[PDB]
Write a structure and sequence with these properties.
The structure is cut from a larger assembly and holds chains A (about 70 residues), B (about 70 residues), C (about 90 residues) and D (about 110 residues). Chain A contains 1 helix and 2 strands. The longest helix of chain A is centred in the last third of the chain and has 8 residues. Chain A has about 70 residues and is low in regular secondary structure. Chain B is mostly helical and about 70 residues long. Chain B has one domain. In chain B, helix 1 packs antiparallel against helix 3. The longest helix of chain B has 21 residues. Classes of the chains: A little secondary structure (about 70), B mainly alpha (about 70), C alpha+beta (about 90), D mainly beta (about 110). Bound molecules: magnesium ion (3 copies). Chain C binds 2 RNA strands through helix 1, strand 3 and strand 4. Chain B: One of its GO terms (molecular function) is rRNA binding.
RNA sequence: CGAGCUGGAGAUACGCUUUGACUCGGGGAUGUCCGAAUGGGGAAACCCACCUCGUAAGAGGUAUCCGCAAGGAUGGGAACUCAGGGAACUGAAACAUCUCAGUACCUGAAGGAGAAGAAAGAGAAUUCGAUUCCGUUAGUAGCGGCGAGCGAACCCGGAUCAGCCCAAUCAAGCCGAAGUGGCUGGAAAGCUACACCUCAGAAGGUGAGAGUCCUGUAGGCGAACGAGAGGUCGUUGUUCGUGAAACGAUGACUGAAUCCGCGCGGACCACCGCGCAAGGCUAAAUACUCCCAGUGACCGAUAGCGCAUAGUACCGUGAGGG
RNA sequence: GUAGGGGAGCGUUCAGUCCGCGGAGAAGCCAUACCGGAAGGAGUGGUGGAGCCGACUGAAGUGCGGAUGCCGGCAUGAGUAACGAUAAAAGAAGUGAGAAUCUUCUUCGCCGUAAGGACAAGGGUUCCUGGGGAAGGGUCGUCCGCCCAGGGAAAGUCGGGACCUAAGGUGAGGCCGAACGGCGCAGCCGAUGGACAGCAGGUCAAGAUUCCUGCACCGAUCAUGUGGAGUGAUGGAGGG
């Protein structure tokens, strides 16, 4: 989980074959289709006073610049 | 028993009108077990009294302070 | 107070033939720690107690009716006053 | 088991009134009410009688034979009567006991 | 409310009832122990403490989370609602796509309803104009190992119909018309002969079949006081399974403008056109049904709920079955 | 004339409507040599004790011997095999409506590291007394571990708790996690282990280091005296 917004939770992953032909081969034969997820990272930050909290890149980025309610 | 001649008394008397019945209510309860309880109702009555002997007392607990 | 708690006198014969020696026994309440009870009695019959002894007791009966039974649970208690024998007269019963 | 509700645990009379057993046996017979069991629709009126044998086993010197007792009935008797014949009830009001209401038929008493 | 009552129990004894019991309505007061359970422990209903108020008996506080503070939260709800996670059997006469399905199940949150909602919309008329629900359009457009099979929306009819705000009568209950004789019978409300009521001939009961015996019904009354941003990669949703495939969505990298400004109108461009996103709250029509009343070309005891009552007996270590 | 197609009808419930029927007696049951082309229908009698035929039309959980079908009742095997260790039993006497089978006596036989005795766990009242005599007891039963009622269980020191800790459990504040949740120091719970004050007898029908009798020990609180001064932690060490 992250600072500004939750995150994690993701969706399926496909893998076809016959992949790409004359402007089109015959087509795309899918051979996969399953399921995955994606997470992030963190570094100690803190508001009100000291803390640590999980901090997502896109957050540590946006926060590294103009601070929003929370301070790097 | 219940009318303005029940509350009529002292809070302590209420107790006296309590701690005395359950003193009868005992000797009664004994009798029974010992066989001779010929006042089955007495029990229920004496009991019913104690009820009142508190409900009232309790009615005061809000009238004179809210 | 005092008059509270006790539940009734233990009739039976042993109890009775236990009385002839100034040992009175009656049924107190299940929850009634040996002290409270020691107290109560004293102040209901006016008298001390040199010794006390108490233990719990189950019930489960019936006559019939597919209604089996069910315990009823009691707590006989047995006391012993000081040489100043007797209690009221609810002894010589 | 339903029971005496079809009516409405309401005895169209008092355990003291006089009544005529209309319908059933003992038609027209009359007597003072004695037991008014509203719930069950039971009425004990000196009218009907029975001679029952008391089941008195080791009942301190048995000698049990056959008593004469009254056996209760239902709405098989029409409460109160004044024209000497059964009568509905309708014209009430009050007395010096406006603290109450009466009843009456063609006539007006009870 | 007016003779009875003393629970089912069918029994005896004691008794209680006009200074109107009982019973029915409607508020209070009591409400041991366990249970979110929360003084601490705990193999539920037990075992042990402490502080304060105190006649001692006895009273009360002693949990964690938000908040100065009031005050709010933890739990429990048959089904209905949304959300996070999400099968397989099965079909395709095999099978990996696809189908079965985002169903079943798990979990979180909530209410009596929810969800949704006031346009960077849908549509091709320079039209409509929040959301939702029923009809239809249509099994049309389309999706599809273009196989099995899956399947819209606009328009139009109808339920109902609001947009507002930020940031820069139902319950208790009371009153309530009108018949007798004779006959059959164990008993008549049946037969028979005369009679009555009818804004009450709905219904149940009464020794067999009841307008006029009882309870009722039509109709009338009826209370202290009680309710009502763009993109690239990976993927995905909508008919959208990669296809020329838009748009929406987001995990990862990036990263704009602002009126001679911005988005979209299914790649893409111009032209034409509709709308102004990154803040929010919102009745109502919608769903279900533990509970209640009414009804039934529904059952009437191997039927009907499992139960004319029992989740009991009985079976299982248990979930559970019954 | 088999699979199959087509035709006309019988019967069962429920519903609407018509004609009715019934306590001097409905439905259902039972018997029968009648009737109709069948499915089926009627008459009469018996039973029964309250609802019920016939006709037209409508709707059906609508018609049975089969499914190792389902529930229930009753048969066959048949009075057959069994009566659950080959540690035997005999007599007398007693009770009783009735006893091989109960009680008493006197013998016999079997176990005796047990088939004796004391606990644990587990079960609960099964214990004792008086009654009982359906069913249970593989047979009798006057008896029972069965049925009914009453009684019985007594602890400052025995076990446990108000003390301790092991595995393990839990766990403020901490580390992780789609949810639920997963881990986790101190602390806490946690015996099966540690620690800790009594013995000898008597004796209810039925209890005993619990009650009584004799004598004892431990802690606590107070008073008295002695004393005449420190007392000594959630910490250290020793020890357990
Ligand atoms: Mg039957
Ligand atoms: Mg039930
Ligand atoms: Mg068969």
């Amino acid at each position: 989980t992250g600072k500004k917004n939750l995150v994690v939770n993701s969706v399926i992953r496909r893998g076809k074959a016959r992949a790409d032909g004359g402007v089109g081969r015959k087509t795309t034969g899918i051979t996969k289709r399953v399921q995955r997820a994606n997470l992030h990272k963190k570094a100690i930050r803190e508001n009100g006073q000291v803390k640590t909290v999980w901090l997502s890149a896109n957050a540590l980025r946006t926060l590294s610049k103009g601070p929003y309610k929370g301070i790097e | 028993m219940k009318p303005s001649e029940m509350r009529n008394l002292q809070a302590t008397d209420f107790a006296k009108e309590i701690d005395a019945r359950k003193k009868e209510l005992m000797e009664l309860r004994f009798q029974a077990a010992a066989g001779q309880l010929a006042q089955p109702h007495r029990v229920r009555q004496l009991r019913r009294e104690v009820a009142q002997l508190n409900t009232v007392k309790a009615e005061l607990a809000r009238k004179g302070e809210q | 107070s005092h008059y509270d708690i006790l539940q009734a006198p233990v009739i039976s014969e042993k109890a009775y033939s236990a009385m002839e020696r100034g040992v009175y026994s009656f049924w107190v309440s299940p929850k009634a720690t040996k002290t409270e009870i020691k107290d109560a009695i004293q102040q209901a019959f006016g008298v001390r107690v040199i010794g006390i002894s108490t233990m719990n007791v189950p019930g489960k009966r019936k006559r019939v009716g597919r209604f089996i039974g069910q315990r009823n649970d009691r707590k006989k208690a047995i006391v012993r006053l000081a040489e100043g024998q007797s209690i009221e007269a609810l002894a010589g019963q | 088991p339903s029971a005496g509700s079809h009516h409405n645990d309401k005895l169209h009379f008092k355990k003291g009134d006089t009544v005529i057993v209309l319908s059933g046996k003992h038609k027209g017979q009359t007597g003072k009410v004695l037991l008014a069991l509203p719930r069950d629709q039971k009425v004990v009126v000196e009218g009907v009688n029975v001679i029952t044998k008391n089941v008195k086993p080791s009942m301190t010197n048995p000698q049990g034979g056959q008593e004469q007792r009254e056996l209760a009935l239902h709405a098989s008797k029409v409460a109160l009567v004044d024209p000497e014949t059964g009568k509905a009830t309708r014209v009430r009001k009050q007395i010096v006991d406006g603290k109450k209401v009466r009843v009456a038929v063609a006539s007006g008493k009870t």
